Amino acid sequence: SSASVVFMRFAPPGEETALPPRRATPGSVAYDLFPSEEMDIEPMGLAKISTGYGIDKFPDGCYGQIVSRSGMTWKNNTSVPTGTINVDYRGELKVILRNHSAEKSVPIRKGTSIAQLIFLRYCDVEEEQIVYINETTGERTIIDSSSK
Amino acid sequence: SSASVVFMRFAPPGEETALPPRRATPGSVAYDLFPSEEMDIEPMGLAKISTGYGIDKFPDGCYGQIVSRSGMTWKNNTSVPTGTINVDYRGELKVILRNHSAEKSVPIRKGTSIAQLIFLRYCDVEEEQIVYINETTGERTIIDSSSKKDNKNQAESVRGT
Amino acid sequence: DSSASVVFMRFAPPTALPPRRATPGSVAYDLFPSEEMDIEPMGLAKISTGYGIDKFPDGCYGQIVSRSGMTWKNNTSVPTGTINVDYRGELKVILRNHSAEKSVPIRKGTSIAQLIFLRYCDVEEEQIVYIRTIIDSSSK
Numbered sequence: 282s283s284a285s286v287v288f289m290r291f292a293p294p295g296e297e298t299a300l301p302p303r304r305a306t307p308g309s310v311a312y313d314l315f316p317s318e319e320m321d322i323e324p325m326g327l328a329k330i331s332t333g334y335g336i337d338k339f340p341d342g343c344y345g346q347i348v349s350r351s352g353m354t355w356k357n358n359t360s361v362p363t364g365t366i367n368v369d370y371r372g373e374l375k376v377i378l379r380n381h382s383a384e385k386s387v388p389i390r391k392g393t394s395i396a397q398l399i400f401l402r403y404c405d406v407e408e409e410q411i412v413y414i415n416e417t418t419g420e421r422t423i424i425d426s427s428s429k
Numbered sequence: 430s431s432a433s434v435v436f437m438r439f440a441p442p443g444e445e446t447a448l449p450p451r452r453a454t455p456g457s458v459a460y461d462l463f464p465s466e467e468m469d470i471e472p473m474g475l476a477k478i479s480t481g482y483g484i485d486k487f488p489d490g491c492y493g494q495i496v497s498r499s500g501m502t503w504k505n506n507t508s509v510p511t512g513t514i515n516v517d518y519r520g521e522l523k524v525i526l527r528n529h530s531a532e533k534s535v536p537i538r539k540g541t542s543i544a545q546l547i548f549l550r551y552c553d554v555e556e557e558q559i560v561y562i563n564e565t566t567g568e569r570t571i572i573d574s575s576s577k578k579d580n581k582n583q584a585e586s587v588r589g590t
Numbered sequence: 591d592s593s594a595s596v597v598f599m600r601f602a603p604p605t606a607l608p609p610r611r612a613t614p615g616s617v618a619y620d621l622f623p624s625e626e627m628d629i630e631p632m633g634l635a636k637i638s639t640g641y642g643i644d645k646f647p648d649g650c651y652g653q654i655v656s657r658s659g660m661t662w663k664n665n666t667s668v669p670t671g672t673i674n675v676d677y678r679g680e681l682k683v684i685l686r687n688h689s690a691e692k693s694v695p696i697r698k699g700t701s702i703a704q705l706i707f708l709r710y711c712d713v714e715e716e717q718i719v720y721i722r723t724i725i726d727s728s729s730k
């Protein structure tokens with residue numbers, strides 16, 4: 282399971298839903314995410330968009346980070362201001378998309394990806410300590426310690 | 430001690446400070462960060478908020494990236510527009526939080542977390558080259574090459590301006 | 591071997607200062623502009639850096655992120671920055687000005703963003719399931 286992922290589709294197999302997460306090319310590092318439903322994000326608006334899928338299984342030692350796509354950012358003057366997917370998350374992935382235009386609305390459409398998902402390697406910390414370091418003497422005082 | 434972290438609290442053990450960085454659940458990838466000071470971020474404002482802690486020791490091969498939390502982003506219409514913590518940083522972690530509301534202020538309160546810190550794996554590059562590639566012929570020219578210093582040579586340091 | 595090595599490609603013949611880490615503990619390469627401009631209030635700029643990535647370190651891709659100073663001092667953000675490992679073009683920094691009144695001066699001597707080589711998983715096996723019914727399965 283070092284390089285495998287399992288996405289969970291929230292809609293029943295007979296029902297119409299979002300296009301599945303897909304990497305555009307063999308060198309694409311992220312899966313393009315698509316909306317389940319259409320909308321127009323008003324100027325200066327912030328939208329929480331359902332993608333139709335969750336992550337059932339993550340690659341070993343990775344989590345999912347939703348980041349913006351260059352096209353959506355540049356062409357539509359947007360950003361994706363958050364996107365950290367915890368490895369115990371059993372829900373549907375939502376894309377949070379901000380419109381930075383004071384005048385133009387952002388069209389959200391079924392066939393156009395709105396953001397992309399990267400499987401980043403992170404450290405799942407096993408031992409943590411909080412210390413106070415005395416700047417004059419160099420003395421270290423352990424405040425708290427915890428083992429996961 | 431490859432999957433271990435040490436946070437340094439800047440306030441002496443007898444003084445009131447921020448709640449320590451803490452992961453909310455066993456599957457939470459990031460440590461929730463708390464403020465050591467209170468304020469109200471004006472509409473369209475940007476704040477640099479002290480957390481009360483630094484990182485004394487990072488997990489092997491990782492650095493710290495401060496990123497936004499979904500709740501703070503969505504409920505308070507904010508973003509965390511920067512957050513790269515270098516592995517030689519000995520200072521206090523500060524959260525840079527932007528308010529995107531044109532009308533409402535964002536309340537920053539002790540005990541309410543404002544961002545989260547992830548220990549991401551990165552490549553500490555040891556060898557680098559700069560090349561020029563001719564688009565018509567395909568010929569390559571090496572412009573520069575550098576190997577990251579590894580305490581082989583020492584020299585007296587000289588003051589700047 | 592190529593586990594901790596990078597090759598940058600300069601587009602100008604033997605226009606911008608090269609990507610450079612400020613200190614031994616700096617995790618990212620500061621990127622510099624190959625052109626000057628003033629980003630109008632609430633503007634969004636796509637700034638050329640003068641360099642591409644010819645070779646990435648093994649198992650890494652390039653992520654362009656904001657620098658703290660540029661963000662705080664100039665009220666900016668870097669709202670996108672994912673560099674695919676098959677990208678043969680010049681790196682562009684997308685920089686947003688969040689000020690309603692002040693412009694952001696972009697000048698060749700000042701770094702505008704920074705590039706981190708992050709470790710990621712290049713997925714080899716993927717499945718779509720309905721919760722279990724396998725909907726689709728694909729091997730890269």
Ligand SMILES: O=c1ccn([C@H]2C[C@H](O)[C@@H](COP(=O)(O)OP(=O)(O)OP(=O)(O)O)O2)c(=O)[nH]1
Binds near residue numbers: 374375
């Ligand atoms: O763009 C995003 C970000 C997060 N999430 C989901 C998955 C993630 O595991 C969960 C919580 O994210 P985070 O830890 O950033 O938010 P929080 O404010 O701590 O959430 P809560 O206290 O509701 O858990 O929300 C999304 O679907 N989309």
Ligand SMILES: O=c1ccn([C@H]2C[C@H](O)[C@@H](COP(=O)(O)OP(=O)(O)OP(=O)(O)O)O2)c(=O)[nH]1
Binds near residue numbers: 515516521656657659
């Ligand atoms: O959200 C953030 C980002 C950075 N930092 C600290 C730790 C980091 O190591 C240092 C420098 O960050 P960066 O390299 O992004 O900033 P810079 O503009 O290059 O800073 P400087 O030249 O002042 O070091 O600032 C924070 O506390 N919070």
Ligand SMILES: O=c1ccn([C@H]2C[C@H](O)[C@@H](COP(=O)(O)OP(=O)(O)OP(=O)(O)O)O2)c(=O)[nH]1
Binds near residue numbers: 674684
């Ligand atoms: O800040 C950025 C982001 C991206 N890129 C380049 C390199 C990257 O490989 C390419 C595509 O980025 P992304 O996949 O985010 O954008 P897209 O809208 O999906 O474009 P494409 O259709 O090429 O994948 O654009 C930049 O130069 N600067």
Ligand SMILES: [Mg+2]
Binds near residue numbers: 309
């Ligand atoms: Mg793409």
Ligand SMILES: [Mg+2]
Binds near residue numbers: 453457
């Ligand atoms: Mg959380």
Ligand SMILES: [Mg+2]
Binds near residue numbers: 616
């Ligand atoms: Mg720096």
